[PDB]
Design a protein around this ligand. Structure first.
Ligand SMILES: O=C1CC=CN1c1ccccc1-c1ccc(F)cc1
Length: 186
């Protein structure tokens, strides 16, 4: 099936806990895959203008590991619950992708999660200004604007609202699209 095929592809790229004990400042992100209208989508947040890190930016759900977290996947799931109301029973963590090194002392670990079809986001306005889906296939043929660095513009056909996706967030979205969608019969 579509979902079984996605998880099987993703598992081939799982690094697991190989980099997880290294002594960095540690953050995790959740890359949430949602099946709608017979296609896979990624779920994105727009961060509230209030925040420390990256006010008003498009980001995946995530944040800093705390002492309660059993592991880096727990961090991603805790933060996703706080931001959008995603509960544990509503997500299956499929794999851990290549981590992202930043600022010489920080390591951000991304986890891909399959999201239950009955989940409905409840944006927490202290954390997130907006939540939106993008079809995964978009990232194979994005609308690119050079700002010199590349920026994706996605317009939601439901309402005509345009979002800018950039940086680590854009990079990870492309990676997931390649992993899941490359070399598929029509
Ligand atoms: O500012 C950005 C842009 C993308 C990753 N960062 C970071 C830069 C440094 C430390 C942490 C983050 C981070 C931000 C949001 C999040 F959900 C998880 C990690």
């Amino acid at each position: 099936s579509m979902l079984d095929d996605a998880k099987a592809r993703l598992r081939k790229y799982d690094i697991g806990g190989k980099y997880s004990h290294l002594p960095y400042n540690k953050y995790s992100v959740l890359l949430p895959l949602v099946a709608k209208e017979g296609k896979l989508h990624l779920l994105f947040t727009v961060r509230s203008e209030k925040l420390r890190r990256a006010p008003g930016e498009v980001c995946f759900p995530g944040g800093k590991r705390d002492p309660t977290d059993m592991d880096d996947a727990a961090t991603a799931l805790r933060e996703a619950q706080e931001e959008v109301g995603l509960r544990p029973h509503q997500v299956e963590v499929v794999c851990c992708l290549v981590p992202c090194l930043i600022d010489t002392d920080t390591l951000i670990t991304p986890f891909v999660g399959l999201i239950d079809h009955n989940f409905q986001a409840q944006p927490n306005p202290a954390e997130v200004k907006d939540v939106f889906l993008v079809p995964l296939a978009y990232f194979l043929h994005p609308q690119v604007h050079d700002q010199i660095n590349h920026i994706f513009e996605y317009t939601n056909p439901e309402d005509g609202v345009t979002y800018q996706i950039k940086g680590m967030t854009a990079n990870l979205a492309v990676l997931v699209a390649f992993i899941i969608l490359e070399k598929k019969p029509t």
